[PDB]
Amino acid sequence: HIWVRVQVQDHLFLIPVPHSDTHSVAWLAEQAAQRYYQTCGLLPRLTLRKEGALLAPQDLIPDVLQSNDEVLAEVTSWD
């Protein structure tokens, strides 16, 4: 089982990545944005960083992240 810790503003979310079409960085950013919307009613567009390094939205989660990695999400706009 794979899960990623994503910081969105002052909130830290444990987001699971369940298992056949592999999920992209963009999908993970979308999950984090929904988790953030569920807390406060604002829907951000997010770019993800791992230890300061930008994650490409089109890259696949298993190629750039391991279970329990921590990711910083940056709000680039509000939808």
From Swiss-Prot:
Q: What is known of its domains?
A: The ANK repeats mediate the interaction with the MCM complex and histones, while the LRR repeats mediate the interaction with MMS22L.
Compartment annotation = Nucleus; Chromosome; Cytoplasm
**Which residues does UniProt assign to the signal peptide?**
none
Annotated protein name in UniProt: Tonsoku-like protein
Regarding tissue, the record states: Expressed in heart, skeletal muscle and tracheal epithelial cells.
Q: What does this protein do?
A: Component of the MMS22L-TONSL complex, a complex that promotes homologous recombination-mediated repair of double-strand breaks (DSBs) at stalled or collapsed replication forks. The MMS22L-TONSL complex is required to maintain genome integrity during DNA replication. It mediates the assembly of RAD51 filaments on single-stranded DNA (ssDNA): the MMS22L-TONSL complex is recruited to DSBs following histone replacement by histone chaperones and eviction of the replication protein A complex (RPA/RP-A) from DSBs.
Which family is it part of? Belongs to the Tonsoku family.
What disorder is listed for this protein? Answer: Spondyloepimetaphyseal dysplasia, sponastrime type: An autosomal recessive bone disease characterized by spine abnormalities, mid-face hypoplasia with a depressed nasal bridge, and striation of the metaphyses. Additional features include disproportionate short stature with exaggerated lumbar lordosis, scoliosis, coxa vara, limited elbow extension, small dysplastic epiphyses, childhood cataracts, short dental roots, and hypogammaglobulinemia. Disease severity and clinical manifestations are variable. Some patients have intellectual disability.
How this chain assembles, per its entry, is: Component of the MMS22L-TONSL complex, a complex at least composed of MMS22L and TONSL/NFKBIL2. Interacts with the MCM complex, the FACT complex and the RPA complex. Interacts with MCM5; the interaction is direct. Binds histones, with a strong preference for histone H3.1 (histones H3.1 and H3-4/H3.1t). Interacts (via ANK repeats) with histone H4; specifically binds histone H4 lacking methylation at 'Lys-20' (H4K20me0). May interact with DNAJC9; the interaction seems to be histone-dependent.
Whole protein: which stretch is covered?
933 to 1011 of 1378
